[PDB]
Amino acid sequence: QVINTFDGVADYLQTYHKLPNDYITKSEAQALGWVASKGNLADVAPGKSIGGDIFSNREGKLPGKSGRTWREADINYTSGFRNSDRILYSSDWLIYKTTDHYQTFTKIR
């Protein structure tokens, strides 16, 4: 039910080409009552993590291709304020990780 680690998610993405069922976008989350400054995501959407939004890369920290879109998902989230862990996945399925809020990324896939 909750796939939120870098190998589990990497996994799921590669096989299903979509995020597991416990991910919702910032938008859906706001729709449910999340108020970032309150750190209450887990109170309005228990078991969910933020994920699925476009990640821009206009800074080219990630390999680019004309036509490639990047998406991100929060990793290791249980509750509270958001952490520094993220999964970055492309259109054409390259998978990267960041543990320092996009300071650096590592190829996973």
UniProtKB/Swiss-Prot annotation:
Primary location: secreted
Q: Does the keyword Transcription apply?
A: no
Q: Which residues form the active site?
A: 72 (proton acceptor), 101 (proton donor)
Give the location in the cell: Secreted
Spell out the molecular function terms from Gene Ontology: RNA binding; RNA endonuclease activity
| Claim: Signal is one of the keywords in the record | yes
Q: What is its EC number?
A: 3.1.27.-
According to its record, what are the GO cellular component terms?
extracellular region
Q: Which biotechnological applications are listed for this entry?
A: Introduced by genetic manipulation and expressed in male sterile maize and rape by Plant Genetic Systems and in radicchio rosso by Bejo Zaden. Barnase expressed in transgenic plants will specifically destroy the tissue(s) where it is expressed. After cell transformation, protein expression and plant regeneration, the active nuclease destroys the pollen producing organs thus rendering the plant sterile.
Q: Which UniProt keywords apply?
A: Endonuclease, Genetically modified food, Hydrolase, Nuclease, Secreted, Signal
Question: Into which family does the record put it?
Answer: Belongs to the ribonuclease N1/T1 family.
Tell me the function of this protein. Hydrolyzes phosphodiester bonds in RNA, poly- and oligoribonucleotides resulting in 3'-nucleoside monophosphates via 2',3'-cyclophosphate intermediates.
Its protein name is Ribonuclease
Question: From what organism does this protein derive?
Answer: Bacillus amyloliquefaciens (Bacillus velezensis)
